[PDB]
Amino acid sequence: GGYIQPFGCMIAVDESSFRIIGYSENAREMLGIMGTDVRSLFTSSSSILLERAFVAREITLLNPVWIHSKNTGKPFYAILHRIDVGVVIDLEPARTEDPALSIAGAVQSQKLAVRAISQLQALPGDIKLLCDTVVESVRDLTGYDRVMVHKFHEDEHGEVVAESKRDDLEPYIGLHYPATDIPQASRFLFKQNRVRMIVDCNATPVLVVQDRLTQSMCLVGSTLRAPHGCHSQYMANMGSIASLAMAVIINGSMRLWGLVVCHHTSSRCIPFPLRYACEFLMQAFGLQLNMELQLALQMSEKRVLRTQTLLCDMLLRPAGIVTQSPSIMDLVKCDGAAFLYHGKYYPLGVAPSEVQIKDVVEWLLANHASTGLSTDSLGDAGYPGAAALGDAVCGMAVAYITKRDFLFWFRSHTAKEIKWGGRMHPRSSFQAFLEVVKSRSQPWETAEMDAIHSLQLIL
Amino acid sequence: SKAIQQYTVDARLHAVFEQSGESGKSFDYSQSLKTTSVPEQQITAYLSRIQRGGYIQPFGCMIAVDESSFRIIGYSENAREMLGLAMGTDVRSLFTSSSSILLERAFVAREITLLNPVWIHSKNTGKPFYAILHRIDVGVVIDLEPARTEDPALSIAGAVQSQKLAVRAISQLQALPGDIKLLCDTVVESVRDLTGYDRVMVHKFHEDEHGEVVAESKRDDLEPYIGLHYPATDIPQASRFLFKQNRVRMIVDCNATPVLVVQRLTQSMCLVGSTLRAPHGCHSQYMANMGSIASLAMAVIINGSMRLWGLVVCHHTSSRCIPFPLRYACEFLMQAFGLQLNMELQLALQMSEKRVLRTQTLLCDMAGIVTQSPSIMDLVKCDGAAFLYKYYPLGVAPSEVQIKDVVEWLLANHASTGLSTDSLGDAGYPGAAALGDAVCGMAVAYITKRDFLFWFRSHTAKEIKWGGGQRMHPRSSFQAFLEVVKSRSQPWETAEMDAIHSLQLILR
Amino acid sequence: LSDQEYMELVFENGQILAKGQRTKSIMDLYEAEYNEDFMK
Ligand SMILES: *C(C)[C@H]1/C(=C/c2[nH]c(/C=C3N=C(/C=C4\NC(=O)C(C=C)=C4C)C(C)=C\3CCC(=O)O)c(CCC(=O)O)c2C)NC(=O)[C@@H]1C
Ligand SMILES: *[C@H](C)[C@H]1/C(=C/c2[nH]c(/C=C3N=C(/C=C4\NC(=O)C(C=C)=C4C)C(C)=C\3CCC(=O)O)c(CCC(=O)O)c2C)NC(=O)[C@@H]1C
C-alpha cells in the first residue's frame, strides 16, 4: 500500500459488512487503541453517523463527520470516499474539544466565506485586480508566508501572475516554468478533490497496511496521501516546508485555469473552518473568473471588428492601409508586420529586410504553394534560414492576397516580454523554460487567425 | 429621482394607515394610492417608527448591554420567560461560567469577532441559545435565538448538510448553458429545495422601482403568481434600504403577538441591526390577506455602488422558523446568484450593442430603410414605426392624418432634435384619445425641416398577463398597477435613444 | 475582513442620509479566541 502524511489516519472498511479492509500504521496509536467491525472503535452516536454516511447515495454530502473515539473520547474529523471495493475514512484530530467552540467554528466557516466573497462582489474587466484581491484575502485567512496564483497556458505551462509574500522573501511574479513540472496525472486529480495540502515535507510517510486482497486500492482520492519523490525535494530546495494548492475550475465540461499555491517556511496545519472558508472563496473566485473571461472575449471581438472596419474604410480609399495610425499591427498582438504589394515592401516595427522577405516568399511558393501558414517558429516550420533573423523575427503569420501581394505578422521570441530577476529549483525551471521556447514566439491564437482571415477574405 | 421622491409618498401612506387604525376603520388601498410636500417632522416620525419601533418577534429574547461592567439597559418582556433579571444588573450572571467567558471574549474583540454567534447555555435551565451580537450607538444588542436539544454532532451535521446543499446549488448554477430566465428558474428550485417553503418567487425591480414576479416554484395546491406587476409603493424605500444591510429578512408568524422592548436613555433603541425586529401592522395585514403565515426574503445585490436588482421571496402557509446556518447557506447561494446575474446583464448589454451595430450597418448600406427586411423597426424595440418624407407606415402606426396632426403639434410646441415620450397624454398631445392605447409611446428623430423617423410603442398592459380593491391583496395590487399605466407605454431606455440618435446623425 | 456595521436613515437638513452607529491575521485571531485554557 501507499503512504500517508503522519498528521492523520486512514481506515478502509467494507461498504456492507463494516469490517476493516486496511488501515494506516499509526491509526492504533492515534485512536488510543484487521477484519473487525469498525463501529466498535467509536462512540454510539458516532456509529450511527458513520452508518448514515455509508448508506448515503452521495457520500460527499456527509464528508466532514464529527466523531469521538471510544477509548479516549477525543474528537476527530472524518472524511469518507468509496474507492472501488469499499469505503475509506481519513481521520484528522480536531484541536477543539469544546462542543460550543466546535459549533461556533463550524458556523463561522460559513460566516468568513460570506465576508470574503463580499469583497469580490465589491470589485467593479480586470483579472489582475481580481487575482490580487483573491491572493490578499487568502493570505489574511490562512496566514501563509507566500501566496501566488499560477495560470496555465494553452501549452500547459504555468506563469505566476499574482503574489503576496513577506518583506524578507524574494518575488516570483512573472516566472515561467515548463509544463512538465506538474504531471498530467495531478492536473487530472485537481478536477477531483480540489484541495491538496502538505503539512511538512521533511516528515516520514506512514505505510498503509492492506489485508487476501486484490489489486491494491488507490489512494488518489485521499487527503492524507504522502508527497512524491520529485515534489518533496523540489520543495526542500525551494525553501518551502508546507504547502496548500487549491484548484481554479472554470467552464470548458469543466477545465482547470490555474492554481492558488501557498508556501510557508515551516510546518503549518490550517484548522478546518478556515480551510472550508478558503474552499468556498475559491468556488466564488472560479465563477467570477469564468464570467470575466467570457466578457473579455466579447470585448476583444468588438475591438477587432472596429479595427477591421477602419482598415476596410482606408483599404477602399491599397497601400494606404499600412500608412495611417490604424494599421495591420492593430488586429493582432504582433511585434511587427509587413505588406508586400506589387513588389513593394512596407514593413512596420520589427520586420526583416527586403531580400529576406523575397527569400521567404520564394520558400513559401516552393513548399506551401495554399492560403497561408502560421507558426511560432519559422526555423522549425521548414525554413532553411531563420539564423539571419536571430531572435527579432521568430514567429510568422501569413495571409495570401494574390500571387505576389501578401500580409505578414511577425512576433519575436517568447523571452522579450518575460521579465524575472534571478538541481530542482525555480531558477533551473526558468532556464529550462527559456530553452524550451528558444526562438519560439507566442502561439497565434484561433481568434487572431479568425481576424486575419476576415481581413483576407474581403480583399 | 423617483426613489427619493417615494419617501414622501411612503410617509403619507403610513400616516393614512395609522389614522385608519386609530379610527377603527378599514384601510382603503385603492383610495389611499389614488389620493397619495410633507413636514420634516412627519418624515422623521415615519423613519423613527420604522427603525426605532419598540417591538420584536416572539421567537427569541433581546438584551441590550452597556459595554462597561456588562449592565443591562433594556430587554424584551419575554426575556425572563425563556431564561427560566432587572434593568441595571450583570448579564454575565444569567449564563454559565463558560458561556459568560465566551461572551466576554466576544465583547473584547474589536473590528472582527470570531465568537459571533456564540453557543451559550442558560444558568438556571441549561437551555442552549445562539447569541447574536451587534453594536448600537449606546451599547450592544444580544439576540438570543433558542437552539435544539440535540447532541453537538447533530448540530454540526445540520450545518454541514446545509453547506453542502448550498455548494451543490452553486455548482449547478455555474455549470449552466450561456439566458437569465434559466438562471432564475434554477435558483428558485435550488432555494425551494434547500429551505422547504411552500412557495418561492423572484421579484425584479424595474426602472420605475415597481416590482414583477419573473420566476416561481410552488406546491400544486396554491394559486400561481408568476407574471404579476404591482406598484412600487408596496415596498417602502426604508425597507429596500434596510435590505442592503440585512440581506436576509425572516418573519416567523404574522399572527403572533409582538413583545414590547423595555428600556437614562434619551431615545428608543434602534432595531435595524436586529433580526427579531417585528414587521409593521399593514404588512402583517397584507400577509394575513394573502394567507402567508411565515416569510423569508433575500436580497439580490449586483454591482451597478451596489444596487438591489430584486428579491427572492419565500412563503409558508404556517409558522416556520429555520435555523441560522441555513440562513448562512441561503445568503451564500444568493451571493453566487448575484455574481452570475451581474455578469449575465453585462454580457447581454454587449450583445445588444453588437446587434444594434450590425443593424445600423445594414441600414446604412440600404426609402429603402422601410421597404426591406432589416428595416427601421429592428433598430429599437417598438410595436411600429414610420418614415415621413409622403408617409411610409409600418406596423402599428397612426393614419396619415393622425401623424400629420402629431407633426403639426410637434412643430407648434417643440419646433428640437428628438422626442422620447412614453405617454402622449402626459406630454399633452390634444389628439391622444383618438389613438386609443395602440399608439401610447412615441420616439421621434428629426432628419430635416420635413423628414421624420417615428417609433411607436403601445401600452404596457398589452404584454402583461396574469390569471386574476379596497382590501390589501395581490389582486388589488395588480388592479392598482394597471390603473397607474393607462395611456402609458414602456419607457424608452438610454441605449435605444443612443441608437436612434446614431441613425439620425448617419442619415443627415 | 471586518464585522458588519449598520446605518440608520435620517432626514437631516432637507435630505435623507444614512448615519452610522487590525494587524493580526484571521488565523492568529482564531488561535487567540478559540482557546480552551479557561477550562482547567
Ligand atoms: C519531477 C522530475 C518533475 C515534477 C513533478 C511533480 N510536480 C508536481 C506538482 C507540482 N509541482 C509544481 C510546481 C511548482 N511549484 C512551485 O513552487 C513552482 C514555482 C514557483 C513550480 C514550478 C506545482 C504547482 C505543483 C502542485 C502540487 C502540490 O502538491 O502543491 C507533482 C505532484 C506530487 C505530489 O505529491 O502531489 C510532481 C510529482 N516537478 C518538476 O519540477 C519536474 C519537472
Ligand atoms: C403599508 C401601508 C404599505 C406597505 C408597506 C410595506 N411593504 C413591505 C414589504 C413588502 N411588500 C411586498 C409586497 C408583496 N409581497 C408579495 O408576496 C407580493 C405579491 C405579489 C407583494 C405585492 C414585498 C415583496 C415586501 C417584502 C417582503 C419582506 O419580507 O419584507 C413592508 C416591509 C415591512 C417589514 O417589516 O419588512 C412594509 C412596511 N405595503 C402596501 O401595500 C402599503 C402601501
Author numbering:
A (entry chain C): 111 to 143, 159 to 249, 251 to 337, 339 to 379, 393 to 457, 460 to 511, 513 to 565, 578 to 614
B (entry chain A): 55 to 90, 95 to 142, 157 to 250, 252 to 336, 339 to 379, 393 to 454, 461 to 483, 486 to 511, ...
C (entry chain B): 12 to 32, 42 to 60
Paper text:
The red/far-red light receptor phytochrome B (phyB) plays essential roles in regulating various plant development processes. PhyB exists in two distinct photoreversible forms: the inactive Pr form and the active Pfr form. phyB-Pfr binds phytochrome-interacting factors (PIFs) to transduce red light signals. PhyB covalently binds the linear tetrapyrrole PΦB as a chromophore. In these structures, two parallel phyB-Pfr molecules interact with one PIF6 molecule.
PhyBY276H has been reported to form photobodies such as phyB-Pfr, shorten hypocotyls, de-etiolate seedlings, and activate the expression of light-regulated genes in darkness, indicating that the phyBY276H mutant might be constitutively active and possess a Pfr-like structure. Furthermore, we explored the interactions between phyBY276H and PIF6 and found that phyBY276H interacted with PIF6α, PIF6β, and PIF6αΔC in the dark. The overall folding of the phyBY276H‒PIF6β complex was nearly identical to that of the photoactivated phyB-Pfr‒PIF6β complex (r.m.s.d. of 0.896 Å over 979 Cα atoms). The chromophore PΦB of phyBY276H adopts a “Z” configuration, which is identical to that of phyB-Pr. No photoconversion of phyBY276H was detected under red light irradiation. In PIF6β-bound phyBY276H, the locations and directions of the Y303 and H276 side chains are similar to those in phyB-Pfr. Therefore, residues H276, Y303, and Y361 might stabilize the structure of the PΦB D-ring in phyBY276H.
